[PDB]
Each structure stands twice: as C-alpha cells, then as structure tokens.
C-alpha cells in the first residue's frame, strides 16, 4: 500500500500552483483515487506496447505513444 506516499503537503502545493486558496480536509482521498485511476489507464497502454515489441524494458517512447493516443501529446522527452 504505497498510495500513502503522496503526502498531504504535496497535495497542498499542487493546489497552490493551481490558485486554490482554501482546501477542505476531504479532498485528499478523492485526489488519491483520481490519480490512481489516471495512472492505470496509461500504464496498461505502456505495458501493451512493451509486450508487442517483445521487450522487457519499458521505454520513454512507449509512454509518449500512450499519452498521444488519449490526446495528451507530451513534448520534451524525444
């Protein structure tokens, strides 16, 4: 159970970058669930591309393609 590794201070800092002035005490568990759901959909795709190539090492390109298919093209990692 490593979901507890996303500590409360990090959540506050992220809300601060977004301009949030005051945060209710229940936002943390919802944010944890949202992050877990977002990660699962990307990881499943990355693993799918990795397996098709018969490689055992996950590569940056696999994540780049996985994000592009959902429309979240990421610039910077080649």
């Amino acid at each position: 159970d490593n979901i507890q590794g996303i500590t409360k201070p990090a959540i506050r800092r992220l809300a601060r970058r977004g301009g949030v002035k005051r945060i209710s005490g229940l936002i943390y568990e919802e944010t944890r669930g949202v992050l877990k759901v977002f990660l699962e959909n990307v990881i499943r795709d990355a693993v799918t591309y990795t397996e098709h190539a018969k490689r055992k090492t996950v590569t940056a390109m696999d994540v780049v393609y996985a994000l592009k298919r959902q429309g979240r093209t990421l610039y910077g990692f080649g």
């Binding site: 301009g19 979240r72 093209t73 610039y75």
Partner: protein, 108 residues
C-alpha cells in the same frame, strides 16, 4: 556533370527539401508525390519556426538573460492568441503556469 547545388539554395530556404521529399515517399501517404509539395511545406515549416524563435527571443531580453530555456517558450506560447489556438492541447515539460489570480480571491 555540372557542379551540383542544393535545392534549398535555389528556393532560398534553410530547411532540407531533399529530406522532406524522402519522408513523404516513405510515409505511404500516396503512390506519387509532385515536385511542388515539398518546397511549399518546407517554406511553411521555416516560417512557423522563425515566428516561435522570434517571440521567445523577445521574451528572453525581458529577463536580462542570454540563453533560451523552456520557461520562455511557455510564456511565449500562452501569451499569443494565434499560437495558443494551434497549441491548446500540447503539454510542455518544466513550463509551469502563467501567473493569474481571480479578483474574488484578492484581499478586500
């Protein structure tokens, strides 16, 4: 065998017309590719590159810097109404957000 000279020089372009032509034929977009497609596409790409670099270079002087970094590109794109429309969905690493606070949040 006359002395060869590059097509980019004849058109007056910096981008490589030969490489763009190769990439079109190897992409299987169509079985035949006309002579004018690569010159036009190269000219368009050169224009868009020059506009981005010009805006980033102007943004750099406002910070007394001499070297361009990702933060200046992000500030250049999110500040132009035309570039922002073409690049509304692209995410740039290390870019951060633009400074903005809703007036309701400021002190009374």
């Amino acid at each position: 065998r006359a002395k060869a000279k590059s097509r980019s020089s004849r058109a007056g372009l910096q981008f490589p017309v030969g490489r763009v032509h190769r990439l079109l034929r190897k992409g299987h977009y169509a079985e035949r590719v006309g002579a004018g497609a690569p010159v036009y596409l190269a000219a368009v790409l050169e224009y868009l590159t020059a506009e981005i670099l010009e805006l980033a270079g102007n943004a750099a002087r406002d910070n007394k810097k001499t070297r361009i970094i990702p933060r200046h590109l992000q500030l250049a794109i999110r500040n132009d109404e035309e570039l922002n429309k073409l690049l509304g969905g692209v995410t740039i690493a290390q870019g951060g957000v633009l400074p903005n606070i809703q007036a309701v949040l400021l002190p009374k």
